[PDB]
């Protein structure tokens, strides 16, 4: 039994004709319905898990930390850049 069968079974057992599908009955996995950004960020002793916890954007700044370190090694160490075409930056 899979997510596809579950959604089909719920539609048979609880027929709803509401036009908006967010308002219809749902038996989904908690990961989908519940906001993902609500996870504990520190332990029992109160010490945060990530060294950038106190910035308030630990994941944005952890990513900007990695990309800035890569840039420094490439600049220190020292062709066409269009390895990929028909692509866009993620929104």
């Amino acid at each position: 039994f899979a997510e596809e069968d579950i959604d089909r079974a719920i539609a048979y057992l609880f027929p709803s004709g509401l036009f908006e599908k967010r308002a219809r009955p749902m038996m989904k996995h908690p990961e989908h319905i519940f906001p993902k950004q609500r996870a504990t960020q520190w332990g029992e002793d109160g010490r945060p898990f990530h060294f950038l916890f106190y910035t308030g954007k630990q994941s944005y700044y952890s990513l900007m930390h990695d990309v800035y370190g890569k840039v420094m090694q490439l600049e220190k160490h020292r062709a066409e850049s269009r390895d990929l075409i028909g692509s866009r930056w993620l929104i």
Binding site: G46, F51, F53, Y54, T55, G56
Partner: protein, 223 residues
Amino acid sequence: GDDFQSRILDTPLQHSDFFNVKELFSVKSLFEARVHLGHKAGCRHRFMEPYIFGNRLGQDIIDLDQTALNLQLALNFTAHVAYRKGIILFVSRNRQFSHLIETTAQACGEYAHTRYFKGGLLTNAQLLFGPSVRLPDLIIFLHTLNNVFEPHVAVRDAAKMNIPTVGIVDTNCNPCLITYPIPGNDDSPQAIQLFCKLFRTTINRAKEKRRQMEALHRLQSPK
């Protein structure tokens, strides 16, 4: 049991230099890193004149003997806090050294905030971080001024929360609210790298010492 916990936490405070931080630095070592170079006389703060050896043709020079005494106190304080498993947060707004300071904090095992500091981060932490957020036990200010030449907001806000602050203070900085001021050069890359190394070696030694102290006392309980 109770005796062992008392030994782990009370014995370190009975020695003047339990972690032997004196060896890490020397007046000669500080002079190599250009830690005695200050801003021009025009940029001088009135509360920094005690620490200034003199004015060498317009450039204030920082007495490296006062720096050695003050740095000894600051490094010793930073070690006992790390020994007791306290949280240490490195703070700076100099963008040249943002990556170095974040790399240092990660190496030590501590925390860094080198980005824009949000108003209320410390005085309104529960709203920003959550109900039970544990605030830092020590804030180390590698730079005490922001990029508009004003005191970093966390200097006043750390006093409001009664958090001790170990800060590097230069001739234009205001050391009055810094708990453990370390007079020295903050602009030169060689000076900042020396300070970052000292705080990282000091913190790593204290954390290792705590592990060893716990193993010795713990082993005695069965033995």
